Design a binder for this molecule. Structure first.
Ligand code: NA
Ligand code: NA
Lengths: 377, 377
């Protein structure tokens, strides 16, 4: 079994700690770290690598990501490079990915995933408890898109379709590595692509619950990620999903108190940013949207406005964006960001303020209404 | 011997009349009194329904108009003090209840529980109810906060609903309050504060009944109550409490889910209203406040700022207000309003968003630190 840690900007100590756990694990035959460039961190892990291999009897390799796709060169190139390495330079039967920066990692993540693979599943995804105001891309972009475009499939039921923590069977990794839609997704869209393509190909999926959760400012920290996750859905929108898929999830535990009691973002800063980086093109682009959204966002030039951006207004908005949004156009990018920000604020003030349980319940029903709306049309 | 009082203004007649019926049917209630603000629609409906309710229940149901007994805005204070005057001068009943006209959860239990605690010996019985984490912002940030910073060694800041209009007094407590000029003059929203304070100051023994079943717009809706409740505390600040008081509270149930999952105010409207109705004198009055507060509120001329207004900034702010605020002055009232608004927003986004239990714990701890800070000094 190969374990992969993609990294770029992470501090060395956290990645090295995780490497040491994975290398020590009885079922792990090799650890690979993949980075962007030979920096301080990359050199540190290269230096520390041989002490770790001798101590564990497990080979630890470092490699650079190669340019395999055609978008911004980010996470997708790293993961796809790991797929090639696993397929062409190893004979291991299974590959795990874990983000380099997870601070809650332990032998349990590896064990649970392997045991699920033993059971027969082609793909094992880890999922985690999350704060009511985390996962706003997952919820408002990815799962929403899946519900609205493929309501009869497993896609919108997957818990963490953006999660980078997962295990694949060799054959699943080969299928993804060979798929050109996946190979080209060199940016933040890679996780969406892996998720979508595995489901479309009827790979069987198990979702393991990891109770400790994943420990790793304004909403604008997420803006590139948001743009690329949305572009990934938009790129897939005319695809057909023609076959069922086995999909099961470990029953989740009660959310831990310290996770239920996190705030996901700085509300003040987010309100402020909503009023910034406006341009006449952004103002003119709003003429594509429904009346309450156009007026709501136009208001945002002067003061934060977001009550208008409820569930149905968001679905209406999502449809216009699927049709008109252009990845790489700066005004479209900023507009998406503002529109999503008003959706996040609306949900924060009218749903998340009512409590964790209330929020979870609203989000699941949101998907249910989106699927039903899409299935009736 | 027991009188039940419902002061009223513009409430819907059916809620009030339902409650009147409940009170008069109660075996322990000898007379029901309704005190009307003026001869409006509500008052006419009450006066029509009265003689029939007296006949159906064999209990006298009287209607009267609030008199002008105080020297401030003619409001709740006049209404309640008029009921005291009547209880004392035109009846011989030994106990008086007050209930708000529009409580929708009213039953004989509210009366029985209060009567039973008086039988036990208490001078004053106050009811208290579960409340949502964004309700009771005057109670917490103004009244309980003031009680904690001004009389930390007393029972005052430990009282759960000092602003609550659901309570029972023994005749001698009522007489003492009616006779007190500080109380007689508080014709506005400050009356509840005055009742709570003077009873404690005079060593009246207090019991708090828990009513499990008991209990919109921008913060704007609470602006008049806010400025009058603050003025009430300000008007008492040099008073001394030189005797203890017996005070016990019924143990509270877990908050009902339907109450934990409410929202208390329109956030968007509140953020907007924070940027309005500036005057250059308000800008200049800010010069009296600490630097982060001065800078923070000044920013509110252009965008909402509130992160600065944590509990320590609020305590510093409260001291400046106690010293400088001018009741009845439009700029001072408006500044208090914005100042409290930033405090409620700060608490909403950094505390209440973390969940009900986190919020409750934070609030009780806040009073704890305010008592400690005040007693040390
Ligand atoms: Na090993
Ligand atoms: Na009676």
């Amino acid at each position: 079994s190969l374990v992969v840690f993609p990294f770029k900007h992470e501090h060395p100590e956290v990645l090295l700690h995780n490497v040491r756990v994975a290398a020590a694990h009885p079922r792990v035959h090799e650890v690979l770290c993949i980075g962007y460039e030979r920096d301080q961190t990359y050199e540190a892990v290269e230096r520390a690598a041989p002490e770790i291999s001798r101590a564990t009897g497990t080979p630890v390799s470092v490699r650079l990501q190669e340019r395999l796709g055609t978008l911004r060169p980010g996470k997708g190139d790293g993961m796809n490079t790991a797929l090639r390495y696993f397929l062409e330079e190893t004979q291991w039967e299974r590959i795990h990915f874990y983000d380099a920066d997870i601070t809650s990692f332990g032998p349990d993540w590896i064990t649970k995933a392997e045991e699920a693979a033993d059971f027969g599943y082609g793909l094992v995804r880890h999922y985690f408890p999350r704060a009511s105001t985390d996962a706003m891309i997952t919820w408002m972009i990815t799962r929403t898109g899946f519900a609205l475009l493929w309501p009869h499939t497993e896609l919108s039921w997957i818990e963490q379709p953006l999660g980078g923590e997962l295990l694949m069977r060799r054959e699943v990794a080969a299928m993804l590595y060979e798929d050109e839609r996946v190979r080209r997704r060199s940016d933040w869209g890679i996780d969406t692509l892996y998720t979508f393509v595995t489901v479309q190909q009827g790979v069987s999926i198990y979702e393991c619950y990891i109770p400790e959760g994943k420990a790793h400012g304004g909403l604008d920290d997420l803006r590139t990620m948001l743009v690329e996750c949305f572009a990934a859905i938009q790129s897939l929108q005319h695809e057909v999903v023609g076959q069922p898929a086995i999909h099961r999830q470990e029953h989740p535990h009660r959310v831990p108190v310290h996770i239920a009691e996190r705030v996901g973002y700085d509300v003040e800063a987010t309100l402020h940013r909503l009023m910034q980086h406006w341009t006449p093109r952004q103002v003119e682009l709003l003429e594509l949207f429904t009346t309450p959204v156009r007026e709501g966002l136009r208001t945002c030039q002067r003061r934060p406005a977001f009550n208008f951006m409820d569930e149905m207004a968001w679905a209406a908005t999502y449809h216009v964006l699927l049709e008109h949004f252009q990845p790489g156009d700066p005004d479209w990018e900023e507009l998406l960001f503002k529109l999503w920000t008003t959706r996040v604020l609306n949900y924060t003030m009218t749903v998340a303020l009512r409590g964790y349980d209330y929020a979870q319940q609203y989000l699941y029903r949101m998907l249910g209404r989106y699927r039903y709306q899409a299935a009736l049309e």
